[PDB]
Amino acid sequence: ATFEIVNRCSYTVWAAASKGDAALDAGGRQLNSGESWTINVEPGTNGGKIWARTDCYFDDSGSGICKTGDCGGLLRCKRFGRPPTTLAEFSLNQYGKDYIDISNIKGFNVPMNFSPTTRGCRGVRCAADIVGQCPAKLKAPGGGCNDACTVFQTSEYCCTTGKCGPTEYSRFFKRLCPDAFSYVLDKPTTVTCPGSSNYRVTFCPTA
C-alpha cells in the first residue's frame, strides 16, 4: 500500500514510519512546510505507526536528537518514538480488511488527519490545540502534551491489569479529540477500510 505523508505545518517536521522492530520504507525523513513524502508499505503489515518529530538535529550519518518522538537518536526510525507523539496506526490486509486509527495514548505533539485516498471508508482527525490547552502536569518542556501513563506510571493510567477506566487526563484528550483513542480501553475509534486501500497522513491539516 501507498501512504503519502504531507507536512502542512508552518514548521519543519521529521516524519517517521515504523512497525516497532523495523523501519517502514526508509523509516524517516525531513519534511519542510508543504513537502510530501511517498512511502510503500508491505501488504499484511501489522501494527504500523506514522508520527511526526519536532526540533530535531541530525549530523551527516543520520544521528542526533529530536525534542518529541525521538527513536533512539536516528533519522531513519527502526523503533517507535519517545512520547509525546500523536500516532497514525494501521494494520493492513487482516482478513480482507485494513484497520486505521489515530491515538493519543502516547500523548500529542502535532495535529493530524489520517484519510484513505481510495474508496470505501472515511478518515479520522485530531486537529485541536491540545498543546495550548494541555493540563500543567502533562506539559512536556520539549513541546507537546504527554499522556498520564508516561508521566505518572500507575496501573490505572497504564491499564497494566487490563482493567482501567477513563480518568481526568484521558477525558481531556477525548473532549478535544473524540475520534482518537484517549486511553488503552477507550471505546474503539478504529475505521475499517477495504483491504489494500491507500492513504494520506497530513500534519497540521487545518493551519
From Swiss-Prot:
Q: Which domain of life is it from?
A: Eukaryota
Going by the UniProt record, its keywords in alphabetical order are: Cytoplasmic vesicle, Disulfide bond, Signal, Taste-modifying protein
Which Gene3D superfamilies does the UniProt entry name for this protein? Thaumatin (2.60.110.10)
Among Pfam families, the record links this protein to: Thaumatin
Q: Where in the cell is it found?
A: Cytoplasmic vesicle
Q: What are the cysteine partners in each disulfide bond?
A: 9-204, 56-66, 71-77, 121-193, 126-177, 134-145, 149-158, 159-164
SMART domains tied to this protein: THN
Q: Could you tell me which PROSITE patterns the record lists for this protein?
A: THAUMATIN_1 (PS00316), THAUMATIN_2 (PS51367)
Keyword Signal on entry? yes
Q: Does the keyword Signal apply?
A: yes
Q: What does this protein do?
A: Taste-modifying protein; intensely sweet-tasting. It is 100000 times sweeter than sucrose on a molar basis.
What family does the Swiss-Prot or TrEMBL record give for this protein? Answer: Belongs to the thaumatin family.
What is the name attached to this protein's record? Thaumatin I
Query: Species name for this entry?
Result: Thaumatococcus daniellii
